[PDB]
Design a protein around this ligand. Structure first.
Ligand code: NAG
Ligand code: NAG
Lengths: 338, 338
């Protein structure tokens, strides 16, 4: 268990002792955790067997998994060639959300040149290596290793087949009327004002694993329709994952990569209730492709402050938020349906 | 939010930053928290109005509530008499579980001698002040006050009528495969071995408030029948509140006061699986009223290590656990049905 000390402003006290500590590692720019294959030689053999099985490539679950592949790929290919394996691993850059894949790597056993055959990691959708023949979520943390600068997390091949996110790195807690669902890439923050509802969400990236019921507060009496963050995008089945006047945001800007969700106004914009406004549709950005600002938005039955996305490209409103004045084709809209 | 540093053996790392810390305050003998009425003068007027409305007395929710009454009672009665009110508060000692009561104190306004009329706090069941005419769970934490030695918790009268435990003091969390539901009196520990299941529970006292769904992990797909700690005794509606081969322990030794639940063998006893054994019945103690030890127990479909209670009087086995050799009347059995 965890032993330590902390300053709780809410209870206006400083306390020390055993218990459980949930940290915010999504805000920290530094990667305080790092992934490492348990064995490089074994992993090499896994892929050729994966290749043998007819697997063209792989899709990482998260940026950190993606990053892991980036560092090891040289070492893998060198082995692959010194072993004499024809295959060579290609790690393709991933921008946007990390999608899932039906195939899974199988557990077995108990500088670099170009090469003839490729194992493709991530990147865009290709007909060369369609996702239907790619692996995903095939690894899990066996244990941790002490790191001076960064905690080491040793991965291993999953024996079971799941869509569930790795439980180990998940931290979930509620105290002093603050409720948190978190992992290394997700920080979902809900608070008790007048009521309990979603307030803040930060996603280093968007991923398509599923969130465990075991690590889910308020999992009873669930309407999937009311879940802001969709289940298929690793949204937790919680009644914490809700806000009055909003539904599932299946058409949010998920393919933008980093997504910051909160309830406020997009800079220089206005949202207002109106029955003359239009019904929910794809999340729209305030700035258009030209960059023009859109001042007047509306919504029918949403609450205020309004659902807000922040993205490298700009900021977006929720699906229920619609432009007061615009024709629809002219603006940037999320093309994600999940 | 909480800010601090802690040593996580599981992840073999030391980390510092913002987040959420759940402390084990049920193990600490010292009362790092203390209850205080927001206003003694107001509280006095509350009771006489309660008395006026026909409220004979009160039942505390927890030992800490009970303790609050103990310290304040002199000061109350002094006021009550210096005010000239006929009523005086009698705080009766509470041993065993803290039961609920239908009446609630109403919020309003915006050394000591004996006396003629009494307002009774806790104690045994009386026909003089039946529980049906007593108050319970009428107060809640408004805010905290910094204390050097002990954190101050200021109470206030609840406007809504609930059976729910006070959310403020609740800490619930799961990390590194340790799941905890806790408050100032309850420490419920479930761990991930082969599976997720209950492992440890420590109750300073037993209370009849209800555990909030909002602060409950794994609250989906609930069979109330399988919940080890019953709902009616602030048992969390969690699939963490379960163990294979066991059901609701409605007839556990709850009226003993402090109850420590775990899975092991009661000192000098043996539990074994047998179809010849008997069906579930009232939790029985290993030592009889004489003190005689009972070596041989059995169970039908329970798992091992067996469900174990530890109590000041002695140790007890779970309901599914039965004596191998005994006649039933001869032994100490819980007389609690909840
Ligand atoms: C790829 O295959 C060709 C066969 O035509 C062979 O000449 C070449 O050496 C191979 N490359 C590697 C890196 O094995
Ligand atoms: C109790 O009532 C009697 C009435 O006969 C009165 O004399 C006495 O002063 C009362 N005591 C208090 C403490 O009010």
């Amino acid at each position: 268990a965890d032993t330590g000390c902390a300053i709780d402003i809410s209870r206006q006290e400083l306390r020390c002792g055993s218990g459980v500590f949930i940290h915010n590692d999504v805000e920290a720019w530094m990667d305080r955790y790092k992934y490492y294959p348990e064995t490089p030689q074994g992993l090499a053999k896994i892929i050729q067997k994966a290749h043998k099985e007819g697997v063209c490539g792989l899709r990482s679950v998260s940026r950190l998994e993606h990053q892991m592949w980036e560092a090891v790929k040289d070492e893998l290919n060198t082995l692959l060639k010194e072993n004499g394996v024809d295959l060579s691993v290609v790690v393709e850059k991933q921008e946007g959300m990390y999608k899932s894949a039906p195939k899974r790597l199988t557990a077995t056993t108990e500088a670099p040149e170009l090469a003839n055959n490729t194992f493709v990691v991530d990147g865009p959708e290709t007909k060369e290596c369609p996702t239907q023949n790619r692996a995903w979520n095939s690894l899990e943390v066996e244990d941790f290793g002490f790191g001076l600068t960064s905690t080491r997390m040793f991965l291993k091949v999953r024996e079971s087949n799941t869509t569930e996110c790795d439980s180990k790195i998940i931290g979930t807690a509620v105290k002093n009327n603050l409720a948190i669902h978190s992992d290394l890439s997700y920080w979902i923050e809900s608070r008790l004002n007048d009521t309990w509802k979603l307030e803040r969400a930060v996603l280093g990236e968007v991923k398509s694993c599923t969130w465990p019921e075991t690590h889910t507060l308020w999992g009873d009496g669930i309407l999937e329709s009311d879940l802001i963050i969709p289940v298929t995008l690793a949204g937790p089945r919680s009644n914490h994952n809700r806000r009055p006047g909003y539904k599932t945001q299946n058409q949010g800007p998920w393919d933008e990569g980093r997504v910051e969700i909160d309830f406020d106004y997009c800079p220089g914009t206005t949202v207002t209730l109106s029955e003359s406004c239009g019904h929910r549709g794809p999340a729209t950005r305030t700035t258009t492709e030209s960059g023009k600002l859109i001042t007047d938005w509306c919504c029918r039955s949403c609450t205020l402050p309004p659902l807000r996305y922040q993205t490298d490209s700009g900021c977006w409103y929720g699906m229920e938020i619609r432009p007061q004045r615009h024709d629809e084709k002219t603006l940037v809209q999320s093309q994600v349906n999940a």
